[PDB]
Amino acid sequence: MQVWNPIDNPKFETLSYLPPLTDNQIAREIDYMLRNKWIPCLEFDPSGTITTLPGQPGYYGGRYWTMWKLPMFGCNNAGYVLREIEHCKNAYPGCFIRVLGFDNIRQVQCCAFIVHKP
Amino acid sequence: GFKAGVKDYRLTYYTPDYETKDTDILAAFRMTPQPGVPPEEAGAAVAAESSTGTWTTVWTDGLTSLDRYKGRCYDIEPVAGEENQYIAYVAYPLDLFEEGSVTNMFTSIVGNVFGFKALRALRLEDLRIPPAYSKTFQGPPHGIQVERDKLNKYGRPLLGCTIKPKLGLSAKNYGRAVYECLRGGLDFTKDDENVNSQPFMRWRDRFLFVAEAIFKSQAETGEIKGHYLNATAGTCEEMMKRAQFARELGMPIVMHDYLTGGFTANTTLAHYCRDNGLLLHIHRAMHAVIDRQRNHGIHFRVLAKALRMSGGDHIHSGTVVGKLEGEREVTLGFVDLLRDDYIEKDRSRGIYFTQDWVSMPGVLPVASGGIHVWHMPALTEIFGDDSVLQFGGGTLGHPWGNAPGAVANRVALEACVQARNEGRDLAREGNDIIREASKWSPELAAACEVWKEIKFVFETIDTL
Amino acid sequence: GFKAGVKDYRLTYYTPDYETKDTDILAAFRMTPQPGVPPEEAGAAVAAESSTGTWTTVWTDGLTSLDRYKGRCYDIEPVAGEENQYIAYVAYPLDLFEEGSVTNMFTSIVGNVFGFKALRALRLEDLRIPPAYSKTFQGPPHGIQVERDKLNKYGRPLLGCTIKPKLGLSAKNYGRAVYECLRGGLDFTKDDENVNSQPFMRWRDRFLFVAEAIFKSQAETGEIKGHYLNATAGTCEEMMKRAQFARELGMPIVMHDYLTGGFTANTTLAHYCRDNGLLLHIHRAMHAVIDRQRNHGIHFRVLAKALRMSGGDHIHSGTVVGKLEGEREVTLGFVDLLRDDYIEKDRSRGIYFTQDWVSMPGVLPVASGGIHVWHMPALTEIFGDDSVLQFGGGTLGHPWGNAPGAVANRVALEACVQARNEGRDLAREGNDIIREASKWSPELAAACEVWKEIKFVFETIDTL
Amino acid sequence: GFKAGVKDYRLTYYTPDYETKDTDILAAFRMTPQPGVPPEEAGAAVAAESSTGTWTTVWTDGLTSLDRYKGRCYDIEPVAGEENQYIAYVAYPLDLFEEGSVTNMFTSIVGNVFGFKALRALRLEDLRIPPAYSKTFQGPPHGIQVERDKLNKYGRPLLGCTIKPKLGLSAKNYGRAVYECLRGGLDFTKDDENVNSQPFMRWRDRFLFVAEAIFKSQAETGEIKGH
Amino acid sequence: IVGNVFGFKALRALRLEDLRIPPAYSKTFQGPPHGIQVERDKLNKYGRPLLGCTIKPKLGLSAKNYGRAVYECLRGGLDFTKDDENVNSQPFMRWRDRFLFVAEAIFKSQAETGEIKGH
Ligand SMILES: O=C(O)[C@@](O)(COP(=O)(O)O)[C@H](O)[C@H](O)COP(=O)(O)O
Ligand SMILES: O=C(O)[C@@](O)(COP(=O)(O)O)[C@H](O)[C@H](O)COP(=O)(O)O
Ligand SMILES: [Mg+2]
Ligand SMILES: [Mg+2]
Ligand SMILES: [Mg+2]
Ligand SMILES: [Mg+2]
């Protein structure tokens, strides 16, 4: 028998229960979004906590982050998304960073994962 | 003039050359006449006694127009592989139904014709709802897209678990097995269908002990969590009281059994849940008394399209491999009717008509019943994302506890998602993926060894 | 200790030597196992998954007492005249049900076991309700004896008629065919099951035009009259609004369809009707989708005992001779369960248990569905007094009108009552009585000549 | 991609070859363009600023589908007997309106386009309402046939009269000129449009004095009366 | 004043220009709820005109995308934001879902610049 640790063990949603992500396995999740005609984007925030309200169902605080420049409309090669992450990392070396995708026909996001931690 | 007596049914209600309108409801029946009865008199006797008709002539028929208020049979075909079996088509005018009622439609179409002395069997397969009739319903309270945004969860299917034993636990022990499950990796938790309010555990102090575990497990992992609370009751005044106490505590979701509770009580809860911001989960109980046999009853593909009109955000839909009966092609056919906006005719899956929904939101399907970690690659290829997966005894039956038994259910799903979105075959492989994954996780190699040789294989009864 | 794995069902839930208590609920099932499954594993798999049980072992079983909260099978017998068919008996503890709910009992007993992969059929026949469980229900609002005193009618069965055509009449023509029927000799009048509120006739101005004919026909003959108003609707807020406008006008009786409306909505109308002094009439619609076939479903003798506990003053029960299917012995067996206070075991009529009702009021049965004046002597010997008889097309299809066609239905009943309470045989005779009576009444000789050669004779499907 | 600037209206909203659906609302306009403006730019400038459109390009247009939420002009004809006058046809998708509101339809179709600097006149003539949109309204409370049956009057037109002078009568004199009219052969009587509640006659004691004349004139001729 | 006289057969045109309301008739009305001076004091803004912006495209956006184009506008220097005149409650965006997603952006943009905001 083994015991799961309850102290100082945060998690960050999808893909966060697997071993850490290498640089190769990152440019395989972008070629899957490009093969279905979706639109990449970037975000960053200094904190990651969640707050509530006394008696209002379905209201949570801390779900919006800040957008880097603009969505990349009409992008075909995966070498530009990788270069923009490096520009984002030098300006704010003390924030989290996330990668998103957009489906414009059903109006809903399709992916999300973390690429940098403070 | 007026002439009293008895007449045949095929002199008014059998019209073989008729062109239908785009404002009509259509139905398809499979029937078996008794010996000595023509296949057309029996067909005309089904349209007559559902709209306007009786066994004799009356004088009040001449005070109104009957060709304007009558139903009529227009097509009959024989089944291949049966001496005496046929399929009949019937059309209904629009001005016969009340706007906003699911009760009236079922009272009219199926209320008296199943028990005639001149028949041996009858089954209803499909219906068509014109866009001019579905615009008078509210529909699902939120939908699929408005529910994925409140919870902030994108890119993978959702996960859950139900609490066991079914009955016999107290109120403080019931909420201690919720915290350990939710803190290990799951998203939801649930009551059983028959846990309402009973001498060993009353309803009001369970709602309070469950709400204390969600807050403690939410501040420890940094993710949003929830639990379905059951609002089924014996009267409406009691069902409305248990829905107002979940709103004061700030809970997101509730439950209801819509076939033993009724269709009138399910359209009031749906209206309440829209005006106050709650989510609704629907459980199909007592559905196999009607749906199981091939030659008598109502198919579930018909009971599915009434829920989408009445209102709901989730629904159970069964599994292909498990302890309960189901078929692959029929399931793949009626999931499409639940999730999509335009569906075409495909007789290889059991669809008789073309259906449009003119922008009504879709519903999420739920798969449950006797499934463990070896079925993971097979349940991801059939349903994909946009679905919910539930393990009740495959979580609480782990040899180490409730929390270790929820890490093995999340690692096995993420390991399959990563392999799928890389270009691998989830049908030929699937054993190798789990076998490779159970090498850096010691909680998966333990669950992989107790349920290694468990399968359910029997014959099927329906067979399309 | 705790040992994880999979076990057989017959190691805990099969107890062949058990003596039942007088505080237990009992059930009888007829089943058909799949090839390669012992008849005792299948019986134990039905008791396990209805109270407490699942497909694997869990660690929380040891936090409570299981022999105290479990169901168990104790008797199995084989059917004579079949290879693969058996009868199983199951007992349930009292602390498993919620007091005052018909919904909970059906959710527990029949919610998941009908669709197992290791079965081909299953049917429920009977139940036993101990006196310690039926004392928590209200029951019928008034009863049989409190209803015969408000109306001042003693010594003969009651009479009625329904209005045809089913759909397509306006609101002023609908109330003109009521006055002519009620002024000729009838006691009641009725709507059809699918007349709720529709573009050709809305509900609020029909309630007003019908109330004007009752007052005019009651002051002309000096007898009390009535009409069943239909209160079925799409939500509860609208069903509760049509019941207050009937009380505001001073009407005695209303209607409801309790199988397409639901069990939760039928227990609040019953509570309202007791608190405000109204009478309730119940229509069994959509009942032959479940009850018709011999090897799958639920018998109507079970659905009657739930209505008696939920609440109602009338109920439909079918006829022996007509256009709908029924059997003499089964009907004579389940009428006794509706009208009496103590009933014993009789396997020649289909009763498996002994039932006691400890002073709950009875319910009146109603016969309808395609009967004319030649069936009168046969319907008086079977039911006697304490029943209702309805002729819809046998009244409105008379060659002279609505009022002449209601004198012939009253003369024929009184002529049979007088002959019965004189010592004559109503089975050998009955033709001579009608033939003698149609000599001082010219309205009976006219109806006796249009329906002389009309009978319904086909084969029966159930056959006890 | 995204390119900022100003563009013509006839590059997206003028589709001369389009076949309409049976689930669409249709409108007909008569217009008069200002000098130096083609008759096709002006037509496309009316469909654009009623559903989706503005005077410049924005970046949020690419987050959704625009051919699915846009209105479009499909037919233009000239009026006979006028140098500068035309008729334009515009179609609207169904998912743009709220069910059960007459306010929303008029706010969308006619709310801003009548006061553009590049026009001199504009008039709306007709509309078409599909059956899938009128089924969400209640409609008339009773109708024509349910009202002739409550009053028991068949075979001839109805008759009425309104009371004069318009303003300046007291509450007791107002109700004695009703009895004399109703007892002579009329069926109805009426107030004027600007009699609500005023210092010379308040509303609550006029409702009572009028109800006393109907009862007296109804028991004298044996016919139903009203006001 | 204007209910029947515009459509007489003995006229071809008619237009109304002005009116005069005596002080003995306007004293029976309530008037503006707050005014100009009671509104500049609740917001603490003196010495310059106010600024705003409306959201485009007019119709066709969802409820989560509608509220993330409000935060970016309000955090850059504006004071107000606005709906379009024909955005009430429609199949692509219902009214109760939008009132909640808009209220989440105001709180996040008000705690970052230290000024009062609205919509
Ligand atoms: O009672 C049960 O069996 C379950 O709680 C599953 O428990 P386990 O995971 O322990 O088996 C589900 O409610 C049924 O599967 C519903 O069936 P369906 O969805 O097919 O209608
Ligand atoms: O719809 C009908 O047929 C009836 O109105 C009878 O009309 P008629 O007298 O004109 O035939 C009755 O509701 C059914 O008989 C009910 O059946 P049951 O009581 O057997 O359930
Ligand atoms: Mg369950
Ligand atoms: Mg009927
Ligand atoms: Mg006037
Ligand atoms: Mg505007």
Distance (Å, rounded) from C-alpha B423 to C-alpha C31?
A: 48
Cα radius of gyration rounded to whole Å, chain B: 26
Instruction: Identify each DSSP E strand in chain E by its residue range.
Output: none
d(CA C339, CA C77): 31
Amino acid sitting at position D188: F
Other C-beta atoms closer than 10 Å to the C-beta of A24 total 7
Written as one letter, the residue type at C405 is G
Please answer yes or no on whether D58 and E58 come within 8 Å at the CB atom.
no
**Which has the closest alpha carbon to B393: C5, D32, D9, C422?**
C5
A107 touches chain B (CB under 8 A): yes
The contacts of residue B434 (CB under 8 Å, 6+ apart) are B373, B374, B376, B377, B412, B415, B444, B448
CA C446–ligand 1 middle distance (angstroms): 64
Do the beta carbons of residue D46 and residue D88 sit within 8 Å?
Answer: yes
Largest CA distance in chain B: 90
Cα–Cα distance, A71 to A67 (Å, whole number): 9
Nearest Cα neighbor of C246 from C216, C202, C223, C277 is C277
Q: Is D67 exposed, middle or buried (0-12, 13-18, 19+ CB in 10 A)?
A: exposed
DSSP for residue C56 = S
**Cis ω for the linkage preceding E57 (within 30 of 0):** yes
CA-nearest of C247, C252, C183, C249 to C213 is: C183
Q: Are the beta carbons of C425 and C434 closer than 8 angstroms?
A: no
CA atoms of C454 and B6, how far apart (whole Å) = 9
- Whole-number Å distance between alpha carbons of B231 and C349: 40
Contacting residues for B426 by C-beta, under 8 A, at least 6 apart: B377, B378, B380, B381, B416, B419, B420
**Sign of the four-CA dihedral B431, B433, B434, B436:** positive
User: Separation of B322 CA from ligand 1 center, angstroms?
Assistant: 10
Nearest of E48, E50, E52, E38 to residue E83 by alpha carbon: E52
E strands in C182-311: 229-230, 253-257, 279-283, 296-298
Query: What chain E residue is nearest to A104 in terms of C-alpha separation?
Result: E61
Token duo for residue C329: 């012995």
Contact B228, B190 (CB under 8 A): yes
| CA distances, C141 to each of B238, C306, C313, D209, D220 (Å) | 20, 15, 7, 47, 48
SS3 content of chain C, % helix, strand, coil (to 5): 35, 15, 50
Gap between the Cα atoms of D72 and D46, Å rounded: 9
Q: Would you list the DSSP string of B317-339?
A: ---SSSSB---HHHHHHHHHHHH
Q: Which residues pair with E90 in a beta bridge?
A: E93
Q: In angstroms, how far is CA B301 from the centroid of its own chain?
A: 8
CB C185 within 8 A of CB C220: no
Rounded CA gap, B115 and B109, in Å? 13
Distance CA B268, CA B261 (A): 12
Give the resolution to one decimal, in Å: 2.9
Structure tokens at D138: 């209640």
What is d(CA C387, CA C369) in angstroms, rounded to the nearest whole number? 15
**Tokens at residue B408, please?**
């093995």
Return d(Cα B28, Cα B353) in angstroms, integer: 10
| C-alpha–C-alpha distance, residues B99 and C393, integer Å | 29
CB A40 within 8 A of CB A88: no
Contact C235, C264 (CB under 8 A): no
Cβ separation E72–A67 shorter than 8 A: yes
Catalytic-residue membership of C283: yes
Contact E109, E75 (CB under 8 A): yes
Cβ proximity of C123 and C297 under 8 Å: yes
Contact A50 B183 (CB under 8 A): no
User: Contact D94/B358, CB-based, under 8 Å?
Assistant: yes
Residue B79: which of B39, B42, B49 has the closest Cα?
B39
Provide the pairing of β-strand D25-33 with D86-92.
antiparallel
Q: Strand, coil or helix: what is A7?
A: coil
Q: Is B326 in the pocket of ligand 1 (CB under 6 A)?
A: no
- How far apart CA B30 and CA B78 sit, in angstroms, is 10
For C27, list phi and psi in degrees, rounded to 5: -140, 150
- Interface residue A13 vs chain B (CB under 8 A): yes
* Residue C324 Cβ < 6 Å to ligand 2: yes
Residue A36 touches chain E, beta carbons under 8 Å: no
Residue C120: closest CA among B298, B287, B294: B294
Q: Which residues pair with D126 in a beta bridge?
A: D28
Through-space distance between the first and last CA atoms of chain E, rounded to whole angstroms: 38
Going by their DSSP bridges, the two strands B72-78 and B86-92 should be labelled as antiparallel
Radius of gyration of chain E (CA): 22
CB B390, CB B190: distance < 8 Å: yes
> What would the DSSP string read from start to end of D156-175?
S-----B-SSSS---HHHHH
Nearest CA in chain A to E96: A58
Instruction: Say if CB B115 and CB C288 are below 8 A apart.
Output: yes
CA E3 vs. chain centroid, Å, equals: 30
Check: CB of residue B206 under 8 Å from CB of residue B242. no
| Structure determined by | cryo-EM
Provide the β-strand partners of residue B212: none
Q: Which residue of E has its CA nearest to A59?
A: E100
Q: Which two tokens stand for residue B305?
A: 């399209």
C213 by Cβ neighbours in 10 Å (0-12 / 13-18 / 19+) ranks as buried
For the CA of C317, the nearest atom of ligand 2: 19
What's the order of all strands across the beta sheet hosting C158-160? C158-160, C388-390, C364-367, C314-316
DSSP string, C303-323: HHHHHHHH--SEEE---SSSS
In whole angstroms, how far apart are CA A44 and each of A14, A22, A33, A93, A113?
17, 20, 20, 10, 12
What does the alpha-carbon distance between residue B412 and residue C215 come to, in Å, rounded to a whole number? 76
Q: Is B56 in the pocket of ligand 2 (CB under 6 A)?
A: no
User: Which residues are within 8 A (CB) of C350 and not within 5 positions of it... i.e. 6 or more apart?
Assistant: C125, C301, C329, C330, C333, C334, C464
Which pairing describes strands C342-343 and C388-390: parallel, antiparallel, or unpaired?
A: unpaired
- The whole-angstrom separation of Cα C348 and Cα B259 is 34
Hey, which residues 27-66 in chain D have their CB within 8 Å of chain A? Answer: 59, 62-65
Kindly name the residue from C70, C142, C227, C283 that is annotated as catalytic: C283
D93: phi > 0 → left, psi -120 to 50 → alpha, else beta; which? beta
Please enumerate in sequence order all residues whose Cβ is within 8 A of that of E111, keeping only pairs 6 or more positions apart, or say none. Answer: none
Size of interface A-D (CB pairs under 8 A): 17
User: Which residues in chain A have Cβ-Cβ distances shorter than 8 Å to D65?
Assistant: 104-105
CB B261 within 8 A of CB C103: yes
Q: Strands B119-128 and B296-298, how do they pair?
A: parallel
Task: Answer whether B382's CB lies under 8 Å from B322's CB.
Answer: no
State both tokens at C410. 């009253």
The residues near D106 (Cβ < 8 Å, ≥ 6 apart) are: none
Question: What is the spatial distance between Cα D50 and Cα D93, in angstroms, rounded to a whole number?
Answer: 12
How many angstroms separate the Cα of D82 from the Cα of each of C419, D3, D77?
A: 96, 41, 12
Specify whether the CB–CB gap between C128 and C355 falls below 8 A: yes
DSSP-assigned letter for residue C125: E
Which residues does B449 contact at the CB level (< 8 Å), separation at least 6?
none
Spell out the alpha helix ranges (H) of C348-430. Answer: 376-383, 393-396, 404-420
Cα gap C201→C403, rounded to integer Å: 25
